[PDB]
Motif scaffolding. Structure first.
Motif, PDB file in Angstrom:
ATOM      1  N   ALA A  18     -32.597 -17.064  19.687  1.00  0.00           N
ATOM      2  CA  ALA A  18     -33.816 -17.682  19.142  1.00  0.00           C
ATOM      3  C   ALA A  18     -33.576 -17.855  17.652  1.00  0.00           C
ATOM      4  O   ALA A  18     -33.149 -16.910  16.988  1.00  0.00           O
ATOM      5  N   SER A  19     -33.826 -19.044  17.109  1.00  0.00           N
ATOM      6  CA  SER A  19     -33.464 -19.292  15.707  1.00  0.00           C
ATOM      7  C   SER A  19     -34.385 -20.028  14.727  1.00  0.00           C
ATOM      8  O   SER A  19     -34.078 -21.157  14.360  1.00  0.00           O
ATOM      9  N   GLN A  20     -35.456 -19.419  14.235  1.00  0.00           N
ATOM     10  CA  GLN A  20     -36.268 -20.129  13.238  1.00  0.00           C
ATOM     11  C   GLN A  20     -36.245 -19.492  11.844  1.00  0.00           C
ATOM     12  O   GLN A  20     -36.466 -18.289  11.710  1.00  0.00           O
ATOM     13  N   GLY A  21     -35.975 -20.292  10.808  1.00  0.00           N
ATOM     14  CA  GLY A  21     -35.985 -19.763   9.450  1.00  0.00           C
ATOM     15  C   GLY A  21     -35.487 -20.581   8.269  1.00  0.00           C
ATOM     16  O   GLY A  21     -34.837 -21.610   8.461  1.00  0.00           O
ATOM     17  N   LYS A  22     -35.791 -20.139   7.048  1.00  0.00           N
ATOM     18  CA  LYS A  22     -35.340 -20.803   5.821  1.00  0.00           C
ATOM     19  C   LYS A  22     -33.927 -20.359   5.712  1.00  0.00           C
ATOM     20  O   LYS A  22     -33.128 -20.964   5.023  1.00  0.00           O
ATOM     21  N   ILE A  26     -28.587 -20.515   6.047  1.00  0.00           N
ATOM     22  CA  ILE A  26     -27.757 -19.834   5.059  1.00  0.00           C
ATOM     23  C   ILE A  26     -26.576 -19.153   5.738  1.00  0.00           C
ATOM     24  O   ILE A  26     -25.491 -19.049   5.152  1.00  0.00           O
ATOM     25  N   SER A  27     -26.760 -18.675   6.972  1.00  0.00           N
ATOM     26  CA  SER A  27     -25.652 -18.073   7.706  1.00  0.00           C
ATOM     27  C   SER A  27     -24.594 -19.111   8.057  1.00  0.00           C
ATOM     28  O   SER A  27     -23.394 -18.808   8.054  1.00  0.00           O
TER      29      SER A  27
END
Lengths: 49, 63
Positions: A18-22, A26-27
């Protein structure tokens, strides 16, 4: 109703990321910077192998 | 090759870049080959009787 447990329905499969973010992005940049570090000193005639 | 590598260990401690080390042996190797090609003598002027002896010189060296 057919069972005492009544399991909660997960949307995705177990083991599906699961992948949500600012971040998250960056990764991916740090992953590219990691691969970019290996090819960093190989530039030019005075580089390395 | 290990002798070049052993002497290169001391030069890496001094902080010389490896390409300058490698270019030095390339110029030194061709310079040594150019000198040794001049100093060695030719054996083709001798006849076949003495040319057989030159093989015996190298045959005893290799055995």
């Amino acid at each position: 109703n057919f069972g005492s447990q009544t399991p909660t329905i997960v949307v995705l499969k177990e083991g599906t990321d699961a992948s949500q973010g600012k971040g998250q992005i960056i990764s991916n940049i740090n992953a590219c910077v990691a691969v970019q570090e290996a090819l960093k000193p190989t530039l030019g005639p005075l580089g390395s192998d | 090759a290990s002798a070049l590598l052993d002497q290169a260990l001391e030069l890496i401690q001094k902080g010389i870049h490896p390409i300058k080390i490698a270019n030095g042996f390339d110029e030194a190797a061709k310079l040594a080959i150019s000198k040794l090609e001049e100093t060695c003598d030719d054996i083709s002027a001798s006849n076949d009787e003495l040319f057989r002896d030159f093989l015996l010189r190298a045959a005893k060296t290799s055995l």
